[PDB]
């Protein structure tokens, strides 16, 4: 941030800004992650391979990191992101959880995300049956009705009648 | 239409018929003035002002028996409503569609010399009251009953 025009180019600075971009994915700051992609437009251009790995990961993330997570994990054995790739493994996305699974789907290993990776072994079971079922809130996935299945009713007409009182009275209130 | 009259004596004619100690009451008496037929036979008589006697509870009972009774005030059931309303709303709107052509004429007209343009067709208040009161039946639908 410091204007410091005299500040020299730093090899540590370029990679760490890229590490920060990966860190934003770890804390799930998606709006910030694009803000960081914006933060270094000249770095992003085409080079800055350290910066490139998180931007490629961002393309994978909107695509769904689960499909390309194996490619992302093996994309660089070491880019100075060795601790950061461990954080990337920590930030493996489990947002695919809102779907039928266990017996109804049985295996979600096809997507290749670490949480749903492995067809049925105890390592898969540990992620799959964590807190009973993955995250653990909601109905058990094995007997889950696809999802929460909340639905809706036309009983709201009485509630809509209450809404009607407020809007209609106002039109009269204006006179 | 009722009016009250008291005769004036011919002997009293030489004297002032009605000396006034109060100007405002004479002014109130002046407001009725005289009727042309009464004027023809006014001589030998003097009109006397008539006012309603004070009415309190008497006014109150008729007042209670006006909107509640003389006018429709069932109140328990005071509140057609959805049967012929659709016909009335369509008919008034149709009259407006023809009537609004006169305002369209005024805006297009240069009207350098002021001319009547049949504006103030209105009916907007009539449509507003009818649609809103019928829409207020929602209170009967879900609140007054269940």
mmCIF file of C-alpha atoms in Angstrom:
data_model
loop_
_atom_site.group_PDB
_atom_site.id
_atom_site.type_symbol
_atom_site.label_atom_id
_atom_site.label_comp_id
_atom_site.label_asym_id
_atom_site.label_seq_id
_atom_site.Cartn_x
_atom_site.Cartn_y
_atom_site.Cartn_z
ATOM 1 C CA UNK A 1 0.000 0.000 0.000
ATOM 2 C CA UNK A 2 2.881 2.399 0.832
ATOM 3 C CA UNK A 3 3.446 4.684 -2.203
ATOM 4 C CA UNK A 4 7.224 3.958 -1.871
ATOM 5 C CA UNK A 5 7.981 4.472 -5.613
ATOM 6 C CA UNK A 6 11.606 3.676 -4.575
ATOM 7 C CA UNK A 7 10.417 0.178 -3.447
ATOM 8 C CA UNK A 8 12.354 -2.398 -5.574
ATOM 9 C CA UNK A 9 10.803 -5.491 -7.232
ATOM 10 C CA UNK A 10 10.770 -8.336 -4.646
ATOM 11 C CA UNK A 11 10.855 -12.039 -5.660
ATOM 12 C CA UNK A 12 9.228 -12.837 -2.272
ATOM 13 C CA UNK A 13 6.461 -10.234 -2.909
ATOM 14 C CA UNK A 14 5.219 -11.736 -6.233
ATOM 15 C CA UNK A 15 4.872 -15.332 -4.945
ATOM 16 C CA UNK A 16 3.411 -14.263 -1.541
ATOM 17 C CA UNK A 17 0.709 -12.127 -3.219
ATOM 18 C CA UNK A 18 -0.144 -15.337 -5.120
ATOM 19 C CA UNK A 19 -0.020 -17.241 -1.787
ATOM 20 C CA UNK A 20 -2.469 -14.610 -0.404
ATOM 21 C CA UNK A 21 -4.757 -15.300 -3.407
ATOM 22 C CA UNK A 22 -4.708 -19.038 -2.490
ATOM 23 C CA UNK A 23 -5.240 -18.100 1.207
ATOM 24 C CA UNK A 24 -8.435 -16.182 0.245
ATOM 25 C CA UNK A 25 -9.804 -19.484 -1.187
ATOM 26 C CA UNK A 26 -8.861 -21.181 2.137
ATOM 27 C CA UNK A 27 -10.980 -18.676 4.169
ATOM 28 C CA UNK A 28 -13.740 -18.871 1.470
ATOM 29 C CA UNK A 29 -13.524 -15.106 0.712
ATOM 30 C CA UNK A 30 -14.688 -15.618 -2.941
ATOM 31 C CA UNK A 31 -15.491 -11.898 -3.522
ATOM 32 C CA UNK A 32 -12.000 -11.074 -2.154
ATOM 33 C CA UNK A 33 -10.403 -13.832 -4.300
ATOM 34 C CA UNK A 34 -11.524 -11.964 -7.447
ATOM 35 C CA UNK A 35 -10.512 -8.705 -5.697
ATOM 36 C CA UNK A 36 -6.968 -10.204 -5.424
ATOM 37 C CA UNK A 37 -7.074 -11.344 -9.103
ATOM 38 C CA UNK A 38 -7.879 -7.663 -9.785
ATOM 39 C CA UNK A 39 -5.173 -6.548 -7.281
ATOM 40 C CA UNK A 40 -2.340 -7.652 -9.603
ATOM 41 C CA UNK A 41 -3.543 -7.064 -13.220
ATOM 42 C CA UNK A 42 0.043 -6.735 -14.553
ATOM 43 C CA UNK A 43 1.092 -9.887 -12.647
ATOM 44 C CA UNK A 44 -1.922 -11.842 -13.977
ATOM 45 C CA UNK A 45 -1.357 -10.797 -17.673
ATOM 46 C CA UNK A 46 0.115 -14.199 -18.756
ATOM 47 C CA UNK A 47 3.294 -14.753 -16.656
ATOM 48 C CA UNK A 48 3.906 -14.827 -12.850
ATOM 49 C CA UNK A 49 3.442 -18.643 -12.746
ATOM 50 C CA UNK A 50 3.111 -18.427 -8.918
ATOM 51 C CA UNK A 51 0.174 -15.975 -9.427
ATOM 52 C CA UNK A 52 -1.100 -18.160 -12.332
ATOM 53 C CA UNK A 53 -1.686 -21.303 -10.186
ATOM 54 C CA UNK A 54 -4.426 -19.650 -7.963
ATOM 55 C CA UNK A 55 -6.035 -17.896 -11.010
ATOM 56 C CA UNK A 56 -6.140 -21.332 -12.762
ATOM 57 C CA UNK A 57 -7.523 -22.718 -9.463
ATOM 58 C CA UNK A 58 -10.171 -19.920 -9.525
ATOM 59 C CA UNK A 59 -11.266 -21.055 -13.027
ATOM 60 C CA UNK A 60 -11.375 -24.606 -11.592
ATOM 61 C CA UNK A 61 -13.252 -23.323 -8.470
ATOM 62 C CA UNK A 62 -16.169 -21.761 -10.430
ATOM 63 C CA UNK A 63 -16.046 -24.941 -12.610
ATOM 64 C CA UNK A 64 -16.103 -26.816 -9.298
ATOM 65 C CA UNK A 65 -12.696 -27.493 -7.720
ATOM 66 C CA UNK A 66 -13.852 -31.105 -7.118
ATOM 67 C CA UNK A 67 -13.634 -32.054 -10.844
ATOM 68 C CA UNK A 68 -10.098 -30.621 -11.343
ATOM 69 C CA UNK A 69 -8.812 -30.899 -7.712
ATOM 70 C CA UNK A 70 -6.555 -33.863 -8.667
ATOM 71 C CA UNK A 71 -5.119 -31.744 -11.533
ATOM 72 C CA UNK A 72 -4.682 -28.733 -9.170
ATOM 73 C CA UNK A 73 -2.932 -30.905 -6.511
ATOM 74 C CA UNK A 74 -0.423 -32.251 -9.088
ATOM 75 C CA UNK A 75 -0.212 -28.980 -11.090
ATOM 76 C CA UNK A 76 2.963 -27.913 -9.197
ATOM 77 C CA UNK A 77 4.921 -30.288 -6.872
ATOM 78 C CA UNK A 78 6.632 -27.179 -5.377
ATOM 79 C CA UNK A 79 5.864 -23.536 -6.376
ATOM 80 C CA UNK A 80 6.701 -22.104 -2.880
ATOM 81 C CA UNK A 81 3.049 -23.094 -2.241
ATOM 82 C CA UNK A 82 3.954 -26.413 -0.544
ATOM 83 C CA UNK A 83 2.396 -25.256 2.768
ATOM 84 C CA UNK A 84 -0.333 -23.429 0.754
ATOM 85 C CA UNK A 85 -1.240 -26.588 -1.292
ATOM 86 C CA UNK A 86 -1.642 -28.353 2.097
ATOM 87 C CA UNK A 87 -4.079 -25.489 2.963
ATOM 88 C CA UNK A 88 -5.704 -26.074 -0.494
ATOM 89 C CA UNK A 89 -6.202 -29.758 0.504
ATOM 90 C CA UNK A 90 -7.695 -28.384 3.779
ATOM 91 C CA UNK A 91 -10.026 -26.089 1.738
ATOM 92 C CA UNK A 92 -11.269 -29.005 -0.441
ATOM 93 C CA UNK A 93 -14.845 -27.958 -1.362
ATOM 94 C CA UNK A 94 -17.710 -30.048 0.135
ATOM 95 C CA UNK A 95 -20.450 -27.714 -1.256
ATOM 96 C CA UNK A 96 -21.541 -30.695 -3.457
ATOM 97 C CA UNK A 97 -22.989 -32.172 -0.203
ATOM 98 C CA UNK A 98 -26.473 -30.784 -1.040
ATOM 99 C CA UNK A 99 -27.316 -33.840 -3.222
ATOM 100 C CA UNK A 100 -28.578 -37.458 -2.740
ATOM 101 C CA UNK A 101 -25.795 -39.796 -1.428
ATOM 102 C CA UNK A 102 -25.255 -43.126 0.503
ATOM 103 C CA UNK A 103 -27.349 -46.061 -0.882
ATOM 104 C CA UNK A 104 -29.533 -43.586 -2.874
ATOM 105 C CA UNK A 105 -26.342 -42.479 -4.719
ATOM 106 C CA UNK A 106 -23.973 -44.797 -2.732
ATOM 107 C CA UNK A 107 -20.739 -43.474 -4.351
ATOM 108 C CA UNK A 108 -19.783 -39.845 -5.166
ATOM 109 C CA UNK A 109 -16.074 -40.704 -5.779
ATOM 110 C CA UNK A 110 -16.600 -39.954 -9.530
ATOM 111 C CA UNK A 111 -16.386 -36.141 -8.893
ATOM 112 C CA UNK A 112 -12.905 -36.738 -7.265
ATOM 113 C CA UNK A 113 -13.286 -34.196 -4.387
ATOM 114 C CA UNK A 114 -11.336 -35.527 -1.333
ATOM 115 C CA UNK A 115 -14.447 -35.492 0.958
ATOM 116 C CA UNK A 116 -16.509 -37.668 -1.449
ATOM 117 C CA UNK A 117 -13.396 -39.412 -2.924
ATOM 118 C CA UNK A 118 -13.134 -43.251 -2.447
ATOM 119 C CA UNK A 119 -16.211 -45.415 -3.261
ATOM 120 C CA UNK A 120 -16.832 -46.954 0.246
ATOM 121 C CA UNK A 121 -13.558 -47.400 2.351
ATOM 122 C CA UNK A 122 -13.202 -46.195 5.988
ATOM 123 C CA UNK A 123 -11.113 -43.188 4.820
ATOM 124 C CA UNK A 124 -14.061 -42.211 2.531
ATOM 125 C CA UNK A 125 -16.420 -43.242 5.371
ATOM 126 C CA UNK A 126 -14.624 -40.860 7.773
ATOM 127 C CA UNK A 127 -15.456 -37.875 5.492
ATOM 128 C CA UNK A 128 -18.784 -39.409 4.360
ATOM 129 C CA UNK A 129 -20.016 -40.322 7.882
ATOM 130 C CA UNK A 130 -18.353 -37.392 9.730
ATOM 131 C CA UNK A 131 -20.852 -36.212 12.412
ATOM 132 C CA UNK A 132 -22.951 -39.178 11.179
ATOM 133 C CA UNK A 133 -23.083 -37.722 7.626
ATOM 134 C CA UNK A 134 -20.393 -35.327 6.190
ATOM 135 C CA UNK A 135 -21.139 -31.892 7.753
ATOM 136 C CA UNK A 136 -23.695 -33.659 10.020
ATOM 137 C CA UNK A 137 -26.758 -31.258 10.073
ATOM 138 C CA UNK A 138 -30.010 -32.162 8.162
ATOM 139 C CA UNK A 139 -31.430 -35.685 7.471
ATOM 140 C CA UNK A 140 -28.978 -38.630 7.156
ATOM 141 C CA UNK A 141 -27.863 -38.744 3.479
ATOM 142 C CA UNK A 142 -28.660 -42.483 3.141
ATOM 143 C CA UNK A 143 -32.392 -41.835 3.821
ATOM 144 C CA UNK A 144 -32.309 -38.106 2.861
ATOM 145 C CA UNK A 145 -35.206 -37.011 0.600
ATOM 146 C CA UNK A 146 -32.656 -35.669 -1.977
ATOM 147 C CA UNK A 147 -32.317 -32.517 0.229
ATOM 148 C CA UNK A 148 -34.233 -30.593 2.965
ATOM 149 C CA UNK A 149 -37.319 -30.782 0.652
ATOM 150 C CA UNK A 150 -39.041 -27.867 2.553
ATOM 151 C CA UNK A 151 -41.783 -27.290 -0.132
ATOM 152 C CA UNK A 152 -44.443 -24.480 -0.020
ATOM 153 C CA UNK A 153 -48.230 -24.120 0.644
ATOM 154 C CA UNK A 154 -51.135 -21.842 -0.439
ATOM 155 C CA UNK A 155 -52.021 -21.360 3.281
ATOM 156 C CA UNK A 156 -49.903 -18.114 2.913
ATOM 157 C CA UNK A 157 -53.105 -16.548 1.402
ATOM 158 C CA UNK A 158 -54.114 -15.799 5.017
ATOM 159 C CA UNK A 159 -50.586 -14.317 5.500
ATOM 160 C CA UNK A 160 -51.058 -12.576 2.104
ATOM 161 C CA UNK A 161 -54.393 -11.311 3.489
ATOM 162 C CA UNK A 162 -52.348 -9.765 6.359
ATOM 163 C CA UNK A 163 -49.998 -8.268 3.701
ATOM 164 C CA UNK A 164 -53.143 -7.078 1.827
ATOM 165 C CA UNK A 165 -54.264 -5.183 4.964
ATOM 166 C CA UNK A 166 -51.019 -3.185 5.039
ATOM 167 C CA UNK A 167 -50.811 -2.347 1.318
ATOM 168 C CA UNK A 168 -54.557 -1.692 0.811
ATOM 169 C CA UNK A 169 -54.879 0.477 3.932
ATOM 170 C CA UNK A 170 -51.915 2.588 2.671
ATOM 171 C CA UNK A 171 -53.559 3.212 -0.736
ATOM 172 C CA UNK A 172 -56.614 4.528 1.180
ATOM 173 C CA UNK A 173 -54.311 6.282 3.730
ATOM 174 C CA UNK A 174 -52.848 8.429 0.905
ATOM 175 C CA UNK A 175 -56.472 9.557 0.080
ATOM 176 C CA UNK B 1 -90.784 25.940 5.842
ATOM 177 C CA UNK B 2 -92.422 26.635 9.261
ATOM 178 C CA UNK B 3 -92.283 30.334 10.295
ATOM 179 C CA UNK B 4 -93.597 32.205 13.378
ATOM 180 C CA UNK B 5 -95.529 35.522 13.242
ATOM 181 C CA UNK B 6 -96.912 37.920 15.927
ATOM 182 C CA UNK B 7 -99.365 40.758 15.032
ATOM 183 C CA UNK B 8 -98.403 44.438 15.610
ATOM 184 C CA UNK B 9 -101.118 46.741 17.080
ATOM 185 C CA UNK B 10 -102.363 49.718 14.992
ATOM 186 C CA UNK B 11 -102.059 51.884 18.157
ATOM 187 C CA UNK B 12 -98.445 50.602 18.510
ATOM 188 C CA UNK B 13 -97.737 51.662 14.863
ATOM 189 C CA UNK B 14 -97.034 55.305 15.971
ATOM 190 C CA UNK B 15 -94.435 53.942 18.473
ATOM 191 C CA UNK B 16 -91.415 52.055 17.074
ATOM 192 C CA UNK B 17 -92.719 48.498 16.552
ATOM 193 C CA UNK B 18 -89.577 46.653 17.809
ATOM 194 C CA UNK B 19 -86.894 48.737 19.664
ATOM 195 C CA UNK B 20 -83.631 46.702 19.685
ATOM 196 C CA UNK B 21 -81.207 46.697 22.666
ATOM 197 C CA UNK B 22 -79.022 44.072 20.892
ATOM 198 C CA UNK B 23 -77.621 44.596 17.346
ATOM 199 C CA UNK B 24 -76.398 41.004 16.734
ATOM 200 C CA UNK B 25 -79.851 39.430 17.427
ATOM 201 C CA UNK B 26 -81.461 41.946 15.000
ATOM 202 C CA UNK B 27 -78.828 40.859 12.433
ATOM 203 C CA UNK B 28 -79.751 37.189 13.009
ATOM 204 C CA UNK B 29 -83.437 38.264 12.661
ATOM 205 C CA UNK B 30 -82.440 40.136 9.453
ATOM 206 C CA UNK B 31 -81.043 36.942 7.813
ATOM 207 C CA UNK B 32 -84.580 35.406 7.225
ATOM 208 C CA UNK B 33 -85.821 38.910 6.161
ATOM 209 C CA UNK B 34 -89.323 38.771 4.554
ATOM 210 C CA UNK B 35 -91.184 36.532 2.038
ATOM 211 C CA UNK B 36 -92.793 38.197 -1.019
ATOM 212 C CA UNK B 37 -96.246 36.707 -0.207
ATOM 213 C CA UNK B 38 -95.668 37.549 3.502
ATOM 214 C CA UNK B 39 -94.667 41.097 2.412
ATOM 215 C CA UNK B 40 -98.093 41.467 0.746
ATOM 216 C CA UNK B 41 -99.846 40.915 4.117
ATOM 217 C CA UNK B 42 -96.853 41.896 6.363
ATOM 218 C CA UNK B 43 -98.491 45.136 7.648
ATOM 219 C CA UNK B 44 -100.261 44.710 11.071
ATOM 220 C CA UNK B 45 -97.907 41.771 11.873
ATOM 221 C CA UNK B 46 -94.203 41.343 12.781
ATOM 222 C CA UNK B 47 -92.132 38.204 12.017
ATOM 223 C CA UNK B 48 -90.522 36.675 15.162
ATOM 224 C CA UNK B 49 -87.289 34.601 14.934
ATOM 225 C CA UNK B 50 -87.676 30.825 15.580
ATOM 226 C CA UNK B 51 -84.692 28.658 16.630
ATOM 227 C CA UNK B 52 -84.530 24.953 17.564
ATOM 228 C CA UNK B 53 -84.670 24.607 21.384
ATOM 229 C CA UNK B 54 -81.487 23.143 22.920
ATOM 230 C CA UNK B 55 -81.329 19.406 22.063
ATOM 231 C CA UNK B 56 -78.795 17.236 23.968
ATOM 232 C CA UNK B 57 -79.681 13.588 24.759
ATOM 233 C CA UNK B 58 -82.609 14.149 22.349
ATOM 234 C CA UNK B 59 -80.075 15.131 19.679
ATOM 235 C CA UNK B 60 -77.870 12.200 20.799
ATOM 236 C CA UNK B 61 -80.569 9.507 20.441
ATOM 237 C CA UNK B 62 -81.532 10.652 16.892
ATOM 238 C CA UNK B 63 -77.760 11.042 16.199
ATOM 239 C CA UNK B 64 -77.245 7.441 17.451
ATOM 240 C CA UNK B 65 -80.331 6.447 15.406
ATOM 241 C CA UNK B 66 -79.090 8.207 12.259
ATOM 242 C CA UNK B 67 -75.936 6.496 10.896
ATOM 243 C CA UNK B 68 -76.673 3.332 12.943
ATOM 244 C CA UNK B 69 -80.439 3.403 12.227
ATOM 245 C CA UNK B 70 -81.779 6.027 9.745
ATOM 246 C CA UNK B 71 -78.718 5.318 7.530
ATOM 247 C CA UNK B 72 -77.542 1.685 7.184
ATOM 248 C CA UNK B 73 -75.601 0.854 10.362
ATOM 249 C CA UNK B 74 -76.111 -2.862 11.062
ATOM 250 C CA UNK B 75 -72.507 -2.738 12.429
ATOM 251 C CA UNK B 76 -72.627 -6.422 13.492
ATOM 252 C CA UNK B 77 -73.309 -7.113 9.766
ATOM 253 C CA UNK B 78 -72.820 -3.613 8.220
ATOM 254 C CA UNK B 79 -69.885 -4.730 6.008
ATOM 255 C CA UNK B 80 -73.051 -7.536 -5.113
ATOM 256 C CA UNK B 81 -69.642 -7.205 -3.381
ATOM 257 C CA UNK B 82 -68.053 -9.743 -5.802
ATOM 258 C CA UNK B 83 -70.983 -10.559 -8.148
ATOM 259 C CA UNK B 84 -71.949 -7.408 -10.137
ATOM 260 C CA UNK B 85 -68.765 -5.502 -9.166
ATOM 261 C CA UNK B 86 -66.919 -6.943 -12.196
ATOM 262 C CA UNK B 87 -69.658 -5.537 -14.475
ATOM 263 C CA UNK B 88 -69.573 -2.093 -12.785
ATOM 264 C CA UNK B 89 -65.730 -1.898 -12.844
ATOM 265 C CA UNK B 90 -65.616 -2.840 -16.571
ATOM 266 C CA UNK B 91 -68.418 -0.352 -17.445
ATOM 267 C CA UNK B 92 -66.879 2.683 -15.631
ATOM 268 C CA UNK B 93 -63.438 1.889 -17.140
ATOM 269 C CA UNK B 94 -65.069 1.717 -20.611
ATOM 270 C CA UNK B 95 -66.645 5.170 -19.983
ATOM 271 C CA UNK B 96 -63.156 6.420 -18.956
ATOM 272 C CA UNK B 97 -61.588 4.996 -22.156
ATOM 273 C CA UNK B 98 -64.042 7.087 -24.235
ATOM 274 C CA UNK B 99 -63.848 10.055 -21.776
ATOM 275 C CA UNK B 100 -59.988 10.113 -21.725
ATOM 276 C CA UNK B 101 -60.069 10.932 -25.479
ATOM 277 C CA UNK B 102 -61.179 14.513 -24.513
ATOM 278 C CA UNK B 103 -57.982 15.009 -22.331
ATOM 279 C CA UNK B 104 -55.954 13.500 -25.245
ATOM 280 C CA UNK B 105 -57.566 16.202 -27.453
ATOM 281 C CA UNK B 106 -56.594 18.999 -24.982
ATOM 282 C CA UNK B 107 -52.872 18.038 -24.873
ATOM 283 C CA UNK B 108 -52.694 17.767 -28.715
ATOM 284 C CA UNK B 109 -54.714 21.027 -29.104
ATOM 285 C CA UNK B 110 -52.524 24.182 -29.301
ATOM 286 C CA UNK B 111 -55.337 25.897 -27.267
ATOM 287 C CA UNK B 112 -53.891 29.385 -27.926
ATOM 288 C CA UNK B 113 -57.402 30.664 -27.137
ATOM 289 C CA UNK B 114 -58.786 28.946 -23.993
ATOM 290 C CA UNK B 115 -61.630 26.494 -24.887
ATOM 291 C CA UNK B 116 -63.559 23.863 -22.798
ATOM 292 C CA UNK B 117 -62.066 20.355 -23.367
ATOM 293 C CA UNK B 118 -64.475 18.177 -21.263
ATOM 294 C CA UNK B 119 -61.626 17.347 -18.826
ATOM 295 C CA UNK B 120 -62.233 16.391 -15.139
ATOM 296 C CA UNK B 121 -64.060 13.303 -16.456
ATOM 297 C CA UNK B 122 -62.638 11.873 -13.202
ATOM 298 C CA UNK B 123 -64.444 8.645 -12.096
ATOM 299 C CA UNK B 124 -60.925 7.843 -10.752
ATOM 300 C CA UNK B 125 -62.178 8.386 -7.169
ATOM 301 C CA UNK B 126 -65.296 6.260 -7.893
ATOM 302 C CA UNK B 127 -63.132 3.412 -9.259
ATOM 303 C CA UNK B 128 -60.668 3.820 -6.354
ATOM 304 C CA UNK B 129 -63.377 3.618 -3.652
ATOM 305 C CA UNK B 130 -65.143 0.617 -5.245
ATOM 306 C CA UNK B 131 -61.987 -1.456 -5.845
ATOM 307 C CA UNK B 132 -60.455 -0.715 -2.393
ATOM 308 C CA UNK B 133 -63.629 -1.411 -0.325
ATOM 309 C CA UNK B 134 -64.194 -4.754 -2.151
ATOM 310 C CA UNK B 135 -60.459 -5.575 -1.620
ATOM 311 C CA UNK B 136 -61.021 -4.799 2.124
ATOM 312 C CA UNK B 137 -63.328 -7.892 2.160
ATOM 313 C CA UNK B 138 -60.030 -9.785 2.637
ATOM 314 C CA UNK B 139 -60.433 -8.755 6.324
ATOM 315 C CA UNK B 140 -63.768 -10.663 6.386
ATOM 316 C CA UNK B 141 -62.133 -13.598 4.533
ATOM 317 C CA UNK B 142 -59.292 -14.377 6.966
ATOM 318 C CA UNK B 143 -59.739 -12.165 10.075
ATOM 319 C CA UNK B 144 -63.424 -11.438 10.893
ATOM 320 C CA UNK B 145 -64.053 -15.157 10.272
ATOM 321 C CA UNK B 146 -61.211 -17.636 11.090
#
